[PDB]
Amino acid sequence: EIDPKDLTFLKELGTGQFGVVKYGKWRGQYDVAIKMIKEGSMSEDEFIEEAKVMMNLSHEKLVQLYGVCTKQRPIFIITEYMANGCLLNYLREMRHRFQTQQLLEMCKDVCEAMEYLESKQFLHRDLAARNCLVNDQGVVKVSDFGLSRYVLDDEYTSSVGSKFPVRWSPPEVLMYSKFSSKSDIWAFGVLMWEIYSLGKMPYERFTNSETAEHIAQGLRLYRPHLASEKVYTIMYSCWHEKADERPTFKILLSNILDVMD
């Protein structure tokens, strides 16, 4: 529990999911990000209790949660400051002229965070480039892990919804809402595809409803031009029809390290 008086607000970062995010200082001169939760957007009592579980998650490639301000409204979410913002926008900025080795380390960083989360039996539930962040050093970190459990917006909750992550969902999630470590594996494969496609929308020429019916009949994301045949085999293994035939994040990490150049 961080005291709001022991926090400064210097610049506005954005207005993505949950509301406004601001840059500021904490104890004295610690670089922090303050996520402010918009009224009526979150199952607040349920998030406060889960925050205590989230505080104990500590990994190099996982966005660190320093604390919360819950003794006032709006609720403040105090985290690690990521100067280069969401991965999706970072990929879409063509000026970067990324090397495929830089694209592989972005995949390595996410896979390491997801291996740590899997070893703690924690599910992300919404893994995608939009939910990953980039710091000052170009390091990619997993953010907003398990947060969809507290979103009150009906558009994000329903599988046929306007804001449901259809393009990152396996057949068993769309058809039966069957969530498991294997639905996090599927989304990771889509995230690997987004990275090698430089932020292209998966199944761009399809609507959410067209995507849902085509993946159920075996349609998969094509090999991105920047992805080698070996890199494509890794993301492709995430999309097996049978959930139990998909690798763990431990297997995927060894596969990624195996093709490092």
Binding site: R130, K163, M201, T207, N208
Partner: protein, 93 residues
């Protein structure tokens, strides 16, 4: 002190023709974007204002092209002329 960035995209119809190969995955319609001074550059969901050269991407469900234009490009001459200063300052506040 140039007023227009793309003269070939000054008419609503010229901006509409660019949206021919507009991806069906984008939760915003060409007509709404063209009205707000935007045209498709041909890559992903990237649009550019013909007047201020303001570029916008990663469109979300419920996005109003006029609101986003005033949010990220408040000094746009086209935006002020069509919506008035009152509307611009309202989005900035």
């Amino acid at each position: 002190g140039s007023s227009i960035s793309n003269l070939s995209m000054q008419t609503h119809a010229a901006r509409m023709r660019t949206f021919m190969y507009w991806p069906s995955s984008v939760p915003v319609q060409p007509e709404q974007l063209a009205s707000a001074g935007f045209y498709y550059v041909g890559r992903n969901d990237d649009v550019k204002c013909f007047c201020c050269d303001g570029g916008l991407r990663c469109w979300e469900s419920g996005d109003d092209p006029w609101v986003e234009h005033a949010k990220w490009f408040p000094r746009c001459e086209f935006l002020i002329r069509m919506k008035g200063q009152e509307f611009v300052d309202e989005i900035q506040g």
